[PDB]
Amino acid sequence: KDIATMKGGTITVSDFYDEAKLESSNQSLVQRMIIYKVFNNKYGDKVTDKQVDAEYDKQAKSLGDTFESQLEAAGYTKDTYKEYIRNNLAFEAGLKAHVDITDDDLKTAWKSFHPEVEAQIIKLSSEDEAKDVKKSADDGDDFSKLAKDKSTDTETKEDGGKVKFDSTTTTIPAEVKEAAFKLKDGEISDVITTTNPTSYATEYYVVKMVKNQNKGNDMDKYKDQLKDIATETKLSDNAFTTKVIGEELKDANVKIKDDAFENVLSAFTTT
Amino acid sequence: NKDIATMKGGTITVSDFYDEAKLESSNQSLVQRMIIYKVFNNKYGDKVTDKQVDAEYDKQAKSLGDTFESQLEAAGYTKDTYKEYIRNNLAFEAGLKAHVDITDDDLKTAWKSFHPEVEAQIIKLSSEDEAKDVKKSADDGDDFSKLAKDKSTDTETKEDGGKVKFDSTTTTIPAEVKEAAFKLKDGEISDVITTTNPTSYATEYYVVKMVKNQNKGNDMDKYKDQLKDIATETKLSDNAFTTKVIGEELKDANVKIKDDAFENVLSAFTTTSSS
Incomplete structure (x- = not known):
């Protein structure tokens, strides 16, 4: 009272x-x-x-x-x-x-869907640091070695920077997924500037493609997950x-x- | 509980x-x-x-x-x-x-920018030409009151011959107006005066005739009651x-x-505690 x-x-x-x-x-x-x-x-x-x-x-x-x-x-x-x-x-x-998802809803999900890929990521806090790294990888330092020595993503760092992800993966920056999916197998990204969920997190990243996956035509192959993305949209x-x-x-x-x-x-x- | x-x-x-x-x-x-x-x-x-x-x-x-x-x-x-x-x-x-509890200083600050009450006439126009035209009129002759009745868009003052009384503290009167006005000798007509506000943003024009200006002098004690007031409002x-x-x-x-x-x-x- x-x-x-x-x-x-x-x-x-x-x-x-x-x-x-x-x-x-x-x-x-x-x-x-x-x-x-x-x-x-x-x-x-x-x-x-x-x-x-x-x-x-x-x-x-x-x-x-x-x-x-x-x-x-x-x-x-x-x-x-x-x-x-x-x-x-x-x-x-x-x-x-x-x-109640429609054939249209699915088509929209598809149009910008990418299936799961295996890749390696090094994350750095500097721009030089990542520039310097990419030259290293260019030379031919082992990716996993550079990852172990350098990546600040303590999540992945001990594993050689191994990550698995698709178009929907939330923990992975959009600018990263963007660059990554372009890459052929064993190809190393350019440096990648980004923002994280923080609100100012201006991180840099280098990426090695391990296993890219092409999505093909018949979208029915990925229908279970398209349903999902679509549901999340609505x-x-x-x-x-x-x-x-x-x-x-x-x-x-x-x-x-x-x-x-x-x-x-x-x-x-x-x- | 309901x-x-x-x-x-x-x-x-x-x-x-x-x-x-x-x-x-x-x-x-x-x-x-x-x-x-x-x-x-x-x-x-x-x-x-x-x-x-x-x-x-x-x-x-x-x-x-x-x-x-x-x-x-x-x-x-x-x-x-x-x-x-x-x-x-x-x-x-x-x-x-x-x-x-006002101080000698508080009063002094009030004084520093105080002006006592003056009698004046104001015409407000929404145009720049309109007011330019008006000033020439007042220059010629014609009663101020007459021009005010015919023209002033301040329906507040328009029927009175544009008679206003005010001092430094009068809020309803634009500061650029009080500024120009206080300068004037008795029976002197302002130049045109551009200004702001009204409905939080605008550009009004004004012509002013001084009826009774008042000088504040030295002895600030003359205006003690109102200086105390301004001061009080400040605190x-x-x-x-x-x-x-x-x-x-x-x-x-x-x-x-x-x-x-x-x-x-x-x-x-x-x-x-604050150390």
Whole structure:
């Protein structure tokens, strides 16, 4: 009840509500809170604790030893950042449940798909460093040796910079996939400038092609994964998700009891 | 707690809303302001009257049209509730004012760029030719008042013969205008004057006739009441100032945050060790 007190006067949760319920930020909030609840009641069974754990783990290693404490900063606990993860997973489950892929959808996926290749990567923090490296590889230093000695991708460095990837591989920069796929077997890239998911990560890279793969004609060979890429595409359209969310709110018979949020769903329940 | 909404298996209560909202940064700031408002209201509230609330409401209302009434429903406010906001800011500023102790220096600064009240006439034109034409007219003769009535696009002043009274502090008059105006001797007509603003960006032109200029002289004591005013208004907008004052009043009110989720909400005002 009491959020704070002072000489003559108390501020309650109720007093806080009456103010907050006006704020735009809280319009958006109660919207999301309704959406999450509806999708959780419907698609929540499709999401497992294992997958929540998995997603937590993923993002945690991808965000430092400080993550634990970066959540204190964002007001979250562990168990409550999971709750957010569990909300997003059931949400996307729901969207996925409304995907019906078309021969067009597939064709679009295809047009820019590349199948899995084996390659070796050296990553450097400098431009000279990578320029210097490419000359080395030109001379004929063993790739794996240069990789072992130099690559700053500690992920791959001990293995001779061996990576496997396709057009969809997320951990690998776009400028890299771009250059790599061009290469014939045993051919070494030029230097490659890029940006990473960081927001400023201006890395450089050299690449050796181990096993390139041509995709051919009959797209049916890669139909299982084309279905996938295609599905991921739709899940990012707002025309799509708007519609889907629209449908599910209708399905769940959502009734706004507080006049203050009477308008909160209007973005969906409309023509 | 009340239900905010319901659906097939599931209710969202105010309580459920709270536990989520109390994390949001927006709501950090909110409970901050709400604590500050309450503290100043308990202390300086008597210094604010319903009349002054009404006054402030009225002011802003006429300054927005038939829009306003309905622009508040848009911002989630009622009339009764927008008043409560006005009453919160008035008691806030009351409190700040209560901590102003002006210095000889404060006054001196006010003085340095003060000009006392002058009587003048202003014609506003939306063209450059129009105003160039006008200045020749005033040069010829014809009553200033007449030219003002016929031409000035400032419907504010147009019916009065363009009579304005103002000083250095008058906000409704463009600074490039006050600049040119104060230079003028009595009965002297300005040159054309280009300027800005109005609707946050524009290019108006102005002609000015000086009716009664006033020199400020030496003894700054003559204008002590209004220098104190300018000075007071200056302090009320210093952050170092207001921070300190708000700091003090929270201390005075022995504010205790009962929900760990806002434990940090007053920290901007809790001055501590700095070496």
